[PDB]
Each structure stands twice: as C-alpha cells, then as structure tokens.
C-alpha cells in the first residue's frame with residue numbers, strides 16, 4: 336500500500352542516522368525501521384532514497400555506502416561501498432545509475448544489478464578538496480546536475496558517452512534541481528553563509544530552459560536567507576521550496592508569492608515533498624538539529640492532516656506508491 340519513507344540524517348560525525356516509514360492510511364509512523372529489520376544501523380548522514388522495481392536505495396553520505404532494501408520488509412538485499420561521500424542516485428536503466436558526491440570531482444557510475452562501481456565521470460574545473468555534485472534531472476539523453484558545496488554551476492552530461500558536455504554558471508551553491516512540465520529546470524541557491532571561505536550573497540531561485548540551457552527567470556531573495564529544496568507536485572506545475580517558510584508558486588508565474596504555504600515558526604524546516612498522486616505536502620522540521628524531528632502533513636490548501644515524530648534531522652523523503 337502507499338507509504339512514505341523518511342531518511343533522518345542524524346548529526347554529522349555521530350552515526351545516528353535512521354530510517355522512518357509512515358503509513359498515510361493509518362497515520363502511523365515506525366521509527367528506526369532499518370535497525371528493526373536488519374539488527375544493525377545505517378551509519379552517518381542518510382542523505383536520500385530512491386525506489387525502483389521494489390528495491391529502495393538509501394544513500395548514506397558519511398558512511399561511503401548505498402544500501403538496497405526490500406521496500407516491503409526493509410531487509411537489506413545488497414549494498415555498494417567505496418563511494419567518497421555519496422549524495423543522490425539517478426537510474427538510467429536497470430544496469431546503470433549515477434551517484435553524485437561531495438569532496439570528489441567525479442560522479443560514480445554503478446551497475447545496480449551487480450552492485451558494482453563501473454565507471455566515473457570527471458567534472459571539469461573541480462577537485463577533491465572542494466568538489467560537489469548533487470541532484471540530477473534527465474532531459475532526453477542528457478542529465479543535468481547541480482554542483483552545490485563550494486560550487487556555482489549546473490553541468491550537462493551526455494549519458495551515451497558519460498561525459499560532461501556543457502555547464503552554466505549561476506549564483507553560488509545551487510542546492511537542488513527539478514524539471515517542470517514545460518521542460519524548464521528550477522534550482523534555488525543557498526547563498527553561502529557569513530564567514531564562508533567561498534562566498535556569501537543573496538540567494539536566487541532560477542528557471543532554466545532545458546533545451547537551450549539558458550536562464551529564463553531569476554528571482555533574488557535577501558542576504559541572510561539560506562533557502563533549499565525545490566520540489567514539484569505530481570503534474571510538475573507547482574513549485575515548492577524552503578526559505579524560512581515553505582513557499583509555493585505556479586511554474587508559469589512572473590512574480591514570487593506574497594503569502595507562504597506554511598509560515599516560519601522559529602524552527603528549522605529542512606525537508607519537503609509533495610505526494611505525486613494527491614498533492615498533500617509533507618514538511619520535515621529538524622526543530623533545532625538536536626532533538627527528535629517532526630514531520631507535518633498538510634492538505635493541498637495548507638490544513639494540517641497529521642504530524643508525527645521521526646528521527647534526528649529528517650532531510651529527505653521517498654514515496655512508495
């Protein structure tokens with residue numbers, strides 16, 4: 336039945352990441368489900384999760400590993416190890432996926448059927464000390480990928496030859512990437528932070544044409560803002576993001592909204608997803624990055640349906656639908 340996984344990053348360098356699973360039919364959450372099923376822990380900084388063909392792939396960023404689990408029993412069915420610091424996985428086929436990385440200038444290519452690393456894509460003008468590749472979207476035979484930490488680019492990869500073929504420089508630290516129904520990509524930058532070795536600026540939300548790879552809109556926010564996490568609804572025509580509050584806007588808009596979907600409440604909204612079938616909006620709140628976090632489930636009109644405690648620093652969601 337429909338279900339929602341929530342990955343909890345835990346505290347970096349403390350190895351307290353966990354996996355939660357929520358059943359929206361019964362409004363019940365189960366926490367530490369990977370430990371319950373397997374009798375050992377995920378590790379440090381569970382970062383993201385994708386489901387393909389009955390198998391969930393959980394990226395554990397600071398444990399150099401992706402685990403593959405059966406999505407019904409939560410039992411490990413396999414794992415791939417040896418990643419520098421993995422971020423997101425994107426499948427091109429049953430036998431090929433890309434795994435992006437921080438602290439590396441390469442994207443790793445894997446064969447998910449054999450649980451092996453099978454190649455690398457070298458990113459131009461990037462090194463190990465400050466390299467970063469992050470989220471991916473596909474456009475025909477191309478994958479576009481944002482480069483987040485200490486970077487300011489989207490790259491374009493030809494998936495036939497596994498080569499970076501183009502790049503676009505924007506504001507510092509684009510955090511996330513989605514593709515709307517008009518084949519326009521959206522990304523939102525975090526603007527760095529005060530005292531950053533790389534930079535600190537007002538962040539922006541950008542709309543980029545996938546066909547020509549050119550900026551079509553830039554909406555600039557305020558210095559001090561630290562936004563993240565563009566997300567779309569299932570029809571890919573309403574964009575959501577975090578910038579203190581949760582914001583949303585029609586992808587056709589020429590102006591940013593004046594009223595948020597969910598007002599800032601002096602906590603730490605940190606993760607976000609929209610149910611692709613019914614439009615319900617889930618917001619993961621890290622609270623203060625120390626206590627158990629909470630997820631809020633809202634109707635499409637912003638009415639709270641349910642709320643539930645998860646693990647520490649819930650950061651990402653994956654639908655089982």
Ligand code: CNC
Nearest residue numbers: 344345346347380396397420484485527528623624625648
């Ligand atoms: C808030 C936060 C977080 N950050 Co920073 C982010 N985004 N971060 C920050 C901020 C901290 C300042 C502040 N006080 O607000 C801020 C914006 C400066 C920051 C900066 C960075 N962060 C960075 C990264 C990548 C990370 N950060 C996280 C730790 C990441 C956290 C997410 C997570 N899962 O932990 C995070 C969301 C929450 C940390 C926290 O407050 N914990 C509660 C606190 C009480 O516990 P703590 O143990 O004392 O936490 C401290 C450390 O985590 C330290 N710290 C924070 N980030 C880093 C990154 C590194 C490499 C190191 C060594 C330490 C830190 O700052 C915290 C307060 O002192 C991270 C796990 C987020 C993720 N990717 O999921 C990730 C580390 C991943 C990895 N290395 O494998 C940056 C490299 C990003 C960038 N390019 O801007 C940069 C590095 C700074 C550095 N120290 O070298």
